[PDB]
Design an enzyme around this catalytic site. Structure first.
Site, PDB file in Angstrom:
ATOM      1  N   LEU A   1       5.298  -1.330  -1.128  1.00 35.92           N
ATOM      2  CA  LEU A   1       5.449  -0.177  -0.252  1.00 35.92           C
ATOM      3  C   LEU A   1       4.892  -0.619   1.083  1.00 35.92           C
ATOM      4  O   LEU A   1       3.672  -0.732   1.213  1.00 35.92           O
ATOM      5  CB  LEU A   1       4.686   1.048  -0.807  1.00 35.92           C
ATOM      6  N   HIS A   2       5.768  -1.054   2.002  1.00 31.36           N
ATOM      7  CA  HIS A   2       5.308  -1.486   3.311  1.00 31.36           C
ATOM      8  C   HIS A   2       5.260  -0.300   4.269  1.00 31.36           C
ATOM      9  O   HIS A   2       4.171   0.155   4.616  1.00 31.36           O
ATOM     10  CB  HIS A   2       6.199  -2.624   3.890  1.00 31.36           C
ATOM     11  N   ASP A   3       6.432   0.210   4.703  1.00 27.13           N
ATOM     12  CA  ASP A   3       6.444   1.296   5.714  1.00 27.13           C
ATOM     13  C   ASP A   3       5.734   2.572   5.221  1.00 27.13           C
ATOM     14  O   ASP A   3       4.947   3.130   5.999  1.00 27.13           O
ATOM     15  CB  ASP A   3       7.865   1.553   6.238  1.00 27.13           C
TER      16      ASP A   3
ATOM     17  N   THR B   1      -0.319  -4.203   2.484  1.00 27.70           N
ATOM     18  CA  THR B   1       0.796  -3.519   1.801  1.00 27.70           C
ATOM     19  C   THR B   1       1.273  -4.220   0.536  1.00 27.70           C
ATOM     20  O   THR B   1       1.756  -3.524  -0.347  1.00 27.70           O
ATOM     21  CB  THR B   1       1.934  -3.222   2.772  1.00 27.70           C
TER      22      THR B   1
ATOM     23  N   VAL C   1       3.054   2.794   3.412  1.00 28.56           N
ATOM     24  CA  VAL C   1       1.594   2.577   3.513  1.00 28.56           C
ATOM     25  C   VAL C   1       1.133   2.741   4.964  1.00 28.56           C
ATOM     26  O   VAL C   1       0.096   3.350   5.211  1.00 28.56           O
ATOM     27  CB  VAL C   1       1.140   1.234   2.882  1.00 28.56           C
TER      28      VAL C   1
END
Ligand SMILES: OC[C@H]1O[C@H](O)[C@H](O)[C@@H]1O
Ligand SMILES: OC[C@H]1O[C@H](O)[C@H](O)[C@@H]1O
Ligand SMILES: [Ca+2]
Ligand SMILES: [Ca+2]
Lengths: 319, 318
Positions: free
Chosen positions: A242-244, A196, A246
């Site tokens: 962009l963690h969540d 991410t 992805v």
């Protein structure tokens, strides 16, 4: 018009969790059957408040919100990432309380009940510490076979953590729960921050979002001001990772990634508490070790960054 | 030419033996002693092999100082006899040497030599770090007086070789490694993330046997057992060059790039022996176990053709 895949989102909203939830409510191939809440970015009560407000904002206040554990499995009131997500968990917007109310059952009861009602139909997208998922697994040994996929945003595989050099935030939030989930034998897909951190929205991308016809463009841009400022101060990056979103992309478009199978264990004590380490299985060990005998899980290995960014932007900018 | 003073701390060991024989032939190096430790073989066996190497190299006057028989936490260490053979040199079962070890322990030998020549003596650590940690704990001035400590050990953002978490030297004594890495000495660490990139194939080993190399026959004979372990465990027909690559970092640091960062070692749990570096690219919100320590140099990239060419040239030299 098209076939909808059932999904439960376990989350600590949270700025990027909020972006993901609003994207998920707009995705025509998804049927959100509930939001289950956990601590991390904000206390569990704050996460429940945000989740109920997101259901109202998306125009679906009937979508159940089930409140989860207030503390990790080892116990203790958790310290929350208010320096990343603000004191309210959504960038210090301080919005009025929702009218919609949480369901009576806990997140763990909700996960067990839904997976038992629709066996092999329900996927779980885990966006926070894994406490509720571990509680469901420990309470129900058939949960692992009844759930479809468990897609996890968490860990750092052969890469630096983001709470400290060893650990990523969601895993560090509950290392025991993560170890239970990863050794459960369920069909698990883990998307670590090694993946991410390759996917970013620049300040220019954020301005493109604000200027778009996106249904929630104004709200998303407002929350992201605080979030972007943390990335500038801590990571030295002008924009956001962009963690969540992805991990949500790995649910709908796994073809944008490559995966490696391997046993994953989590360190639960000492300086490396919260560290995730995978055995790829490329070397025959002389003796047994903590990675021996477990069922392997799928670990996201590479990502097609332009395809992922295009998909996320399309959902965020959709009227 | 002017020679840099070097003490080699080692658990010979097949690749340690290759490195020691190369070091005795390097004109810019003065080996002032070998200090022994367990790992590939018990400490007594490492002392026997180190004395035999001094004899083979034609320098039986080079002092061999025997180190600790157990790691700092205590107890009998696990020995890699499945990698280096029961004698530690590939099951050659050679006669015992005439040369004898010195009276002083490895830790006291390290302390004494470093104190005799402050800022001038370097240490090449090829095994578990017990003796180096004992020297640091016993002598508070040791870390400031040692010129440099080059360590073959650890796995940085890569799989270990004892298990997924840990490299053998660090796993052999995690507490000692943590003491060395947080000592404030000028330390350079070469992990197996680097050395697994550097290999000798079966063809390279045959080229070595067929060469005019001074120790070619002996090196090839030891490597038979070593190569068979790599084939069985790693699925590679040949050998990795671990200890010779760390010696290459001493003589030709320009074949590598290095990154500075605080290194800590996990001492308990499933990740016992894991080495983790804080690159310092992110400002943490609060202090953590990597805060406040002096950073060390960690080998990051390697020019594989230059390293292989250097090692081969040294091994094949008459
Ligand atoms: O480390 C990143 C994760 O921690 C927080 O929960 C973020 O929202 C994201 O899920
Ligand atoms: O992991 C490799 C190291 O362990 C052993 O000591 C080898 O000789 C080498 O130094
Ligand atoms: Ca989250
Ligand atoms: Ca060695």
């Amino acid at each position: 018009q098209i076939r909808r895949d059932k999904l439960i989102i376990d989350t600590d909203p949270g700025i990027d969790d909020s972006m993901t939830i609003l994207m998920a409510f707009r995705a025509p191939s998804v049927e959100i059957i509930g939001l289950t809440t956990i601590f991390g970015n904000v206390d569990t009560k704050g996460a429940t408040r945000n989740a109920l407000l997101l259901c109202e904002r998306a125009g679906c206040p009937e979508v159940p919100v089930a409140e989860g554990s207030h503390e990790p499995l080892k116990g203790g009131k958790p310290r929350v990432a208010d320096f990343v997500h603000g004191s309210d968990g959504i960038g210090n917007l301080f919005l009025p309380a929702p009218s919609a109310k949480k369901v009576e059952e806990s997140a763990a009861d909700f996960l067990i009940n839904k997976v038992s009602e629709f066996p092999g139909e329900v996927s779980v997208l885990a966006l926070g510490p894994l406490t509720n998922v571990a509680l469901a697994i420990k309470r129900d040994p058939s949960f692992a076979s009844k759930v479809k996929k468990i897609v996890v945003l968490g860990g750092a595989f052969f890469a630096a953590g983001n709470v400290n050099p060893a650990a990523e935030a969601n895993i560090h939030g509950d290392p025991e729960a993560a170890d239970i989930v990863f050794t459960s034998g369920a069909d698990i897909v883990v998307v670590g921050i090694n993946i991410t951190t390759q996917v970013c929205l620049t300040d220019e991308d954020l301005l493109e979002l604000r200027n778009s016809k996106g249904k929630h463009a104004a709200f998303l841009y407002e929350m992201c001001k605080f979030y972007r400022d943390w990335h500038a101060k801590s990571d030295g990056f002008h924009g956001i990772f962009l963690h969540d979103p992805v991990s949500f992309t790995a649910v709908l478009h796994p073809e944008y990634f490559t995966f490696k199978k391997g046993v994953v264990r989590v360190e639960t004590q000492g300086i490396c508490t919260g560290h995730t380490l995978m055995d790829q299985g490329l070397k025959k060990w002389n003796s047994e070790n903590p990675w021996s005998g477990y069922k392997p899980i799928s670990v996201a290995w590479t990502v097609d960054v332009p395809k992922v960014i295009s998909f996320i932007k399309k959902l965020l900018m959709a009227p």
